[PDB]
């Protein structure tokens, strides 16, 4: 059992994931009390795409080492992803308690899913950042160059058909064309996926494939290019590499557009946000010194021709009736967010709720939940996984997009609005809970940022039972869509590049 588990750990290392699971299973069966085993069976199954089973292992892992914070955090994040709300209140309290005593175990990105103040979030991101910052030894300090073309770098694991590259690409294209004085460098931590996004990016910047490399080497590689300002678009989220940034390969390091919160990190100099999503009230809760673009913090791909979707029926929708949708990551679909969406459904009879098909049995769960809330399960409709262009097309059948709290739709909110679908949100009290709000505000749709849950249901019921007002809202989105600066990458470029040159001067750049 102790041996098995390690062979199967070997299999794990050499992507023979299928057998890793069958070995680790064989171990777990024979020694069902061994927490370390339960724990490896769990990462095993997960990476063999057996979600439900994977989470079952973390449950037992938790039953065996109840006082263990890291396991508890891992279990909660797994249950959110599967929309399994058994004991969510307790689990959520333990994770927050850990952060408070931290130790250390809560991953900051998972933590974004919790009902937690901007303060707890800072505590959490600082605690993590510290354990990393200590175990590492920074590279020889350097300074922003005095003379010349400013070298600006961005590191990300989604350059290509992913959120990051998918938001930044028209931006990178505008900057090549409008900000010649800036030299744009993309350090891509994932390989060429053959997406036209990946080509475009490579065509608009100098794209370095550092996918082969390790933390130390990556830093050293960035430093080889003598990058003056280095943007972390990663951020505490999956596909590393914070330890890269801890080596401070660049003398100025900016947290932007990727991780919707503070880094808590001593190696991170600036965060870039906006007046709305990061307002003065919230600055004390950022370790970075705050910068702000003139408009919304988020760019997007303003060349996308939204395609034509298949008929409502071929998309599983009925023909008449309002389609309110919430395309978002499953972990964001919390009890509070589902309740308020289902409340709309109850009071507006005709009507339907369109969701992304989640992992494991998430969809069965949300069905059963809808029924518990006294709503026909048939009225939830689930979209499968689809290439961006076909996915993006689906918003054409959407009537109103209903945001989640406390972790807003981010790229999906930008996607809706671009296709012309209004987005309803309740801007909360942390950056991540204010991303929709900031798009709406900057687009001019303040009436779509409402105060609380009751207001959310009220506004949505208003729109859903008055198609006249609803059709007119779309019309309004459309005007605002082409006239606000939110979707003017050209202006966004000019803004960014100027704010970039400014930062550079403060750290002693003499331009030219």
Ligand X SMILES: O=C1NC(=O)C(=O)C(=O)N1
CA-to-CA dists, residue 101 to 5, 95, 112, 360, angstroms: 33, 10, 18, 33
Count of C-beta atoms within a 10 Å radius of residue 139? 15
- State how far the Cα of 147 lies from the Cα of 504, in Å rounded to an integer: 11
CB of 353 to ligand X, least distance (A): 16
Q: Smallest Cα–Cα separation from 88: which of 108, 72, 112? A: 72
Question: Does 221 appear as a known binding residue?
Answer: yes
Examine residue 396 and tell whether it contacts ligand X (CB under 6 A): no
Candidates 169, 250, 341, 356: give the one binding ligand X (CB under 6 A): 356
Which residues neighbour 338 within 8 Å (Cβ) at sequence distance 6 or greater?
366, 369, 370, 373
Candidates 178, 215, 388, 397: give the one binding ligand X (CB under 6 A): 388
- Quick check: helix, strand or coil at residue 272? strand
**Cβ nearer to ligand X, comparing 412 with 414:** 412
Q: Smallest Cα–Cα separation from 490: which of 307, 306, 257, 295? A: 295
Q: Which stretch binds ligand X (CB under 6 A): 32-40, 41-49, 381-389, 487-495?
A: 381-389
Q: Which stretch binds ligand X (CB under 6 A): 5-13, 169-177, 251-259, 380-388?
A: 380-388
Tell me how far apart the 2 most distant CA atoms of the chain are, in Å.
Answer: 70
Residue numbers 186-215 binding ligand X by CB under 6 A: none
- State how far the Cα of 226 lies from the Cα of 426, in Å rounded to an integer: 43
CB of 40 to ligand X, least distance (A): 29
Residue numbers 321-350 binding ligand X by CB under 6 A: 327
**Cβ nearer to ligand X, comparing 161 with 470:** 161
- State how far the Cα of 125 lies from the Cα of 326, in Å rounded to an integer: 28
- Exposure letters 305-344 (e unless 16+ CB within 10 A, then b): eeeebeebeebebeeebbbbbbbbbbbbbbeebbebbbbb
Residue whose pair of structure tokens reads 């687009």 in the numeric block? 443
Candidates 137, 147, 385, 506: give the one binding ligand X (CB under 6 A): 385
CB of 276 to ligand X, least distance (A): 24
- State how far the Cα of 429 lies from the Cα of 426, in Å rounded to an integer: 10
CB 190 within 8 A of CB 196: no
**Cβ nearer to ligand X, comparing 86 with 385:** 385
CB of 193 to ligand X, least distance (A): 12
Q: Which stretch binds ligand X (CB under 6 A): 24-32, 382-390, 401-409, 465-473?
A: 382-390
| Strand boundaries in 161-205, DSSP class E | 182-188
**Cβ nearer to ligand X, comparing 160 with 422:** 160
CB of 354 to ligand X, least distance (A): 12
Size of the site for ligand X (CB under 6 A): 7
**Cβ nearer to ligand X, comparing 391 with 487:** 391
Q: Which stretch binds ligand X (CB under 6 A): 249-257, 278-286, 384-392, 480-488?
A: 384-392
Examine residue 354 and tell whether it contacts ligand X (CB under 6 A): no
- Quick check: helix, strand or coil at residue 156? strand
CB 256 within 8 A of CB 499: no
Q: Which stretch binds ligand X (CB under 6 A): 15-23, 335-343, 383-391, 424-432?
A: 383-391
**Cβ nearer to ligand X, comparing 242 with 359:** 359
Question: Does 208 appear as a known binding residue?
Answer: yes
CB of 268 to ligand X, least distance (A): 27
CA-to-CA dists, residue 219 to 153, 187, 234, 257, 491, angstroms: 12, 10, 15, 21, 32
**Cβ nearer to ligand X, comparing 5 with 393:** 393
**Cβ nearer to ligand X, comparing 369 with 391:** 391
**Cβ nearer to ligand X, comparing 245 with 327:** 327
Count of C-beta atoms within a 10 Å radius of residue 131? 13
Q: Smallest Cα–Cα separation from 292: which of 304, 283, 305? A: 283
Examine residue 391 and tell whether it contacts ligand X (CB under 6 A): yes
Residues that constitute the known binding site: 208, 221
Residues that constitute the known binding site for Mn(2+): 208, 221
State the residues that interact with ligand X by CB under 6 A: 327, 356, 385-386, 388, 391, 412
């Amino acid at each position: 059992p102790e041996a098995v588990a390690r062979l199967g750990r070997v299999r794990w290392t050499q992507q023979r994931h299928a057998e890793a699971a069958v070995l680790l299973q064989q171990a777990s069966d024979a020694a069902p009390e061994h927490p370390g085993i339960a724990l490896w069976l769990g990462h095993a199954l997960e990476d063999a795409g057996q979600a439900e089973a994977a989470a079952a292992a973390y449950t037992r892992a938790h039953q065996l080492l109840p006082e263990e914070p890291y396991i508890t955090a891992q279990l909660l994040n797994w249950r959110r992803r599967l929309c399994d709300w058994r004991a969510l209140d307790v689990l959520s309290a333990q994770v927050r308690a850990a952060v408070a005593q931290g130790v250390g175990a809560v991953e900051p990105f998972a933590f974004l899913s919790e009902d937690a103040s901007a303060a707890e979030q800072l505590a959490c991101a600082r605690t993590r950042a510290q354990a990393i910052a200590a175990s590492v030894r920074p590279l020889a300090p350097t300074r922003v160059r005095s003379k010349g073309p400013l070298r600006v770098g961005f590191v990300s694991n989604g350059f290509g058909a992913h959120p990051t590259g998918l938001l930044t690409v028209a931006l990178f294209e505008a900057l090549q064309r409008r900000q010649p004085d800036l030299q744009m460098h993309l350090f891509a931590t994932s390989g060429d996926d053959g997406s036209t996004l990946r080509t475009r990016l490579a065509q608009a910047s100098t794209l370095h494939d550092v996918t082969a490399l390790g933390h130390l080497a990556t830093a050293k590689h960035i430093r080889h290019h003598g990058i003056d300002l280095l943007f972390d678009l990663r951020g505490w989220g999956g596909g590393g590499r914070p330890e890269v940034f801890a080596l401070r390969p660049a003398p100025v390091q900016v947290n932007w557009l990727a991780y919707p919160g503070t880094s808590g990190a001593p190696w991170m100099d600036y965060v870039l946000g906006d007046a709305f999503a990061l307002p003065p009230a919230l600055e004390p809760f950022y370790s970075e010194h705050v910068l702000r673009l003139q408009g919304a913090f988020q760019p997007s791909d303003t060349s996308r021709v939204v395609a034509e979707p298949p008929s409502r029926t071929q998309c599983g929708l009925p023909e008449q009736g309002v389609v309110l949708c919430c395309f978002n990551n499953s972990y964001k679909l919390n009890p509070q967010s589902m309740a308020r969406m289902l409340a709309v459904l109850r009071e507006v009879p005709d009507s339907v709720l369109w969701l992304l098909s989640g992992p494991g049995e998430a969809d069965a769960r949300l069905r059963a939940f809808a029924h518990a809330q006294g709503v026909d399960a048939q009225r939830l409709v689930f979209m499968p996984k689809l290439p961006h262009p076909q996915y993006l097309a689906r918003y054409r059948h959407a009537d109103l997009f209903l945001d989640t709290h406390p972790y807003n739709a981010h790229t999906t909110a930008s996607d809706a609005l671009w296709t012309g679908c209004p987005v309803l949100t309740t801007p909360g009290e942390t950056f991540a809970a204010r991303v929709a709000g900031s798009l709406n505000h900057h687009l001019g749709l303040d009436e779509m940022n409402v105060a609380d849950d009751a207001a959310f249901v009220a506004k949505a019921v208003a729109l859903a039972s008055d198609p006249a007002a609803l059709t007119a809202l779309h019309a309004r989105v459309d005007v605002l869509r082409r006239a606000s600066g939110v979707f003017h990458m050209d202006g966004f470029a000019d803004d960014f590049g100027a704010l970039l040159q400014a930062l550079a001067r403060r750290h002693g750049w003499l331009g030219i």
